[PDB]
């Protein structure tokens, strides 16, 4: 019946004065926008449908023309930023807000699935969706005593809508949407569904991807155990999004570092720094490099939960992005630790793996690796054990590579190996 | 993140 | 001696 329409005849039933036509025209075109294989959103555009569409949005009296709009225009915004902006261009926020309060269950929730096509486009259009009022409507829909009670694919998509108002930064959300929402958001991230627990992460990920006084608002509302506990889960779309969060609240404060560590974070490194996926070992080692660039008494906490022959082993091997962020970790651990520290940092066997590293074809690696040898030497020097280290980086072929170094095209690298053959191999 | 529906 | 997401990769 509606099914394969072309758009001349969509764009015949939708310029009836015919509301059945309309409809029925109406759900062939959103039939149309639904397929697979390239959905001909461009010449729906073009046909100049997307102002009837709104239209329909408002039509109380008829609900399967608002539904069948309210798909057509969630299909049309899903697409290209081009795309999302003729839905936006043809008043479509104001009328799907308007939807929220639906007493159709499908409806609303096409209207929550539509505005999340919209804010996720980017910042503009997320601060365009907040100042036209979605908040407040978005989160009634979510005033029940117990989220169970609501249909798993309505939270799902709720969820995930909140998760794109929450998203971007140039600039990031605004301050007061931000503390509106995040109560909510709280309450998301303490659900059984594995869905919105990864949306519910995502969010907390982007809210806390910005300066201290971001990461602060997340920190203030306890989230921090919750998070560790998500970190732990067997789900890789929780992990990935809970492991994200973590890594962003300890490039913040020391005191919100500690916030972390308090919550037991350290005690999964074990598994994360040994994990299958590349991404999650990568941004686990990430995350161990600025908790070592953090307290000695927090350096402490990664020696103390045996996370030191970790980073021996992500440096040994590892992809070479891993690798990098083991680097970093170890320069970080050097550059605060306690002399006793980098003598425990040696004994772990860290030399070796650091030396065959200077082979690598990274300049960024190469300086990072030079400025950790130079504090493991002014800890030797403060012990009087600069020979025995001296004789370490000769026995594994250290010296051959930091020699070679000396005639490398980067100046910083140049000096730097220079600085130490002339130091303590001459 | 955009999604389309079906 | 911290380092964001966008820093690191």
């Known amino acids: 019946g509606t099914v394969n329409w072309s758009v001349e005849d969509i764009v015949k039933g939708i310029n009836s004065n015919n509301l059945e036509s309309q409809l029925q025209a109406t759900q062939a075109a959103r039939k149309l926008l639904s397929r697979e294989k390239q959905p001909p959103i461009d010449n729906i555009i073009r046909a100049g449908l997307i102002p009837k569409f709104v239209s329909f949005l408002g039509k109380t009296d008829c609900s399967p023309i608002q539904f069948e709009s309210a798909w057509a225009l969630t299909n049309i915004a899903s697409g290209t930023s081009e795309q999302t902006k003729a839905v936006v261009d043809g008043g479509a926020i104001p009328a799907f807000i308007s939807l929220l309060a639906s007493p159709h269950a499908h409806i609303s929730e096409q209207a929550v699935w539509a505005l999340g096509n919209i804010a996720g486009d980017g910042s503009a259009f997320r601060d365009l969706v907040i100042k036209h009022g979605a908040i407040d409507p978005l989160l009634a829909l979510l005033a029940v005593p117990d989220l169970s009670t609501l249909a798993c694919g309505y939270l799902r998509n709720l969820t995930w809508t909140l998760s794109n108002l929450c998203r971007n930064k140039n600039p990031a959300p605004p301050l007061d949407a931000v503390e509106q929402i995040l109560p909510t958001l709280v309450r998301l991230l303490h659900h059984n569904d594995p869905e919105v627990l990864a949306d519910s992460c995502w969010a907390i990920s982007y809210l806390t991807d910005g300066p201290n006084e971001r990461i602060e608002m997340v920190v203030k509302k306890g989230v921090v155990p919750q998070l560790v506990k998500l970190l732990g889960a067997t789900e890789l779309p929780i992990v990935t999004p809970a492991l994200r969060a973590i890594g962003n609240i300890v490039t913040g404060t020391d005191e919100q570092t500690q916030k972390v560590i308090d919550a037991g974070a350290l005690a999964v490194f074990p598994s994360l720094l040994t994990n299958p996926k590349t991404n999650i070992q990568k941004e686990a080692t990430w995350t161990m490099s600025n908790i070592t660039a953090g307290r000695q008494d927090q350096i402490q906490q990664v020696v103390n939960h045996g996370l030191v022959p970790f980073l021996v082993g992500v440096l040994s091997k590892a992809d070479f992005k891993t690798q990098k962020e083991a680097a970093w970790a170890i320069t970080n651990y050097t550059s605060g630790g306690t002399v006793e520290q980098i003598v425990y940092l040696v004994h772990c066997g860290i030399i070796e793996p650091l030396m065959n590293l200077l082979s690598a074809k990274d300049t960024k690696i190469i300086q990072v690796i030079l400025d950790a040898i130079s504090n493991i030497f002014q800890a030797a020097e403060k012990l009087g054990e600069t020979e025995k280290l001296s004789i370490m980086i000769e026995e594994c072929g250290g010296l051959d590579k930091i020699e070679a170094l000396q005639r490398h095209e980067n100046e910083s690298v140049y000096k730097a190996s220079l600085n130490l053959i002339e130091k303590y191999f001459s | ?6």
């Open chain 2, 1 to 6: 993140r955009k999604r389309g529906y079906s």
